[PDB]
Ligand binder design. Structure first.
Ligand SMILES: *[C@@]12=NC3=[C]C([C])=C([C])[C]=C3N([C][C]([O])[C]([O])[C]([O])[C]OP([O])(=O)OP([O])(=O)O[C][C]3O[C](N4[C]=NC5=C4N=[C]N=C5[N])[C]([O])[C]3[O])C1=NC(=O)[N]C2=O
Ligand SMILES: *[C@@]12=NC3=[C]C([C])=C([C])[C]=C3N([C][C]([O])[C]([O])[C]([O])[C]OP([O])(=O)OP([O])(=O)O[C][C]3O[C](N4[C]=NC5=C4N=[C]N=C5[N])[C]([O])[C]3[O])C1=NC(=O)[N]C2=O
Lengths: 148, 148
């Protein structure tokens, strides 16, 4: 059965994997459940978000139906309109390249980035993205760790 | 919360210890952030709840103040009144028997029990209880996974 994971993903399992991941690159610190986190599909074009907890939804002001299927970059514009390769007027291009390259290289990244909520409120997001290997060792997803 | 998840018992740590238990008696399956969690200390009088995740609070409609320091059986009555060794007038007593026995033998139990929310709403609770063994063999904590 899958009664304890209606979201569709064993988030507890990927967090455990990260906790014990060999040679931890960035310092994650304490994550439990109430943490604002999301999971993206690396095996799907533009790494769409395939799971958004809560906390994350509450924080960003977005619903589960508003974020699932989209790339987390929409949080970079006060109107949630962020196209790939484009130039953000309020977010450091440098920062996002660090995130971009780390992701393509399956490398860990931890930065501070300017994000925006649905209503348009700006805020600093202490983000960290750690790739996740599936049952077979291949990196199929990436877990997102957001914090205001 | 501030960073990602500090204030509290090492819940993440027990979830890890639990998934890696090489004696699976019951099947937990995948677990996400929607899973209501509670940690109980079997060595304290009447196995009181020492930790309750927000999902549990949200599910049972009670607050942290209201569930902390108490035995989860309070959920077996629409008014929160459930004294030990007493006959409940709604619940299936076999489910209540099975649970208690399991808990006394430090055995994993998985049932569907009849619970009640703060507002009186009745719900079927897919309850799974797994005790955590100590590095010394002793069982102090027991983790409960509940989902309507
Ligand atoms: C979000 N959380 C979250 C969670 C998870 C699980 C993942 C995988 C990622 C996030 N992110 C990041 C977001 O999804 C995305 O990865 C990020 O926006 C960067 O990637 P992308 O594809 O948007 O990059 P793009 O469009 O190329 O823009 C970069 C920027 O840099 C300039 N650029 C381009 N080539 C360059 C250059 N500068 C210098 N040198 C070269 N060679 C461009 O002009 C662009 O402006 C999350 N994002 C978020 O904001 N918040 C989270 O919580
Ligand atoms: C709750 N979650 C949760 C989480 C965690 C971590 C634990 C450890 C436990 C739970 N539970 C269970 C609850 O706290 C409690 O353990 C459970 O209700 C059983 O224990 P208890 O103390 O209530 O038993 P009691 O009072 O002895 O009553 C048994 C009952 O059965 C009948 N009986 C008694 N002797 C019998 C007999 N029938 C037949 N033969 C004999 N010899 C009587 O009718 C008794 O009244 C959680 N509980 C919950 O409801 N929801 C959760 O999510």
């Amino acid at each position: 059965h899958t009664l304890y994971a209606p979201g569709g993903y064993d988030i507890m399992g990927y967090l455990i994997q990260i906790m014990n991941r060999p040679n931890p690159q960035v310092e994650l610190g304490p994550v439990d459940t109430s943490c604002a986190l999301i999971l993206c599909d690396l095996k799907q074009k533009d790494t769409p978000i395939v799971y958004a907890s809560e906390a994350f939804l509450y924080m960003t002001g977005y619903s589960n139906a508003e974020v699932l299927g989209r790339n987390c970059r929409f949080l970079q514009s006060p109107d949630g309109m962020v196209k790939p390769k484009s130039t953000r007027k309020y977010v450091d291009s440098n920062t996002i390249n660090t995130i971009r390259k780390a992701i393509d290289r399956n490398a860990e990244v931890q930065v501070e980035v300017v994000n925006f909520k649905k209503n348009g409120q700006r805020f600093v997001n202490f983000l960290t993205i750690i790739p996740v290997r599936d049952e077979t060792g291949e990196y199929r997803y990436s877990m997102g760790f957001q914090c205001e």
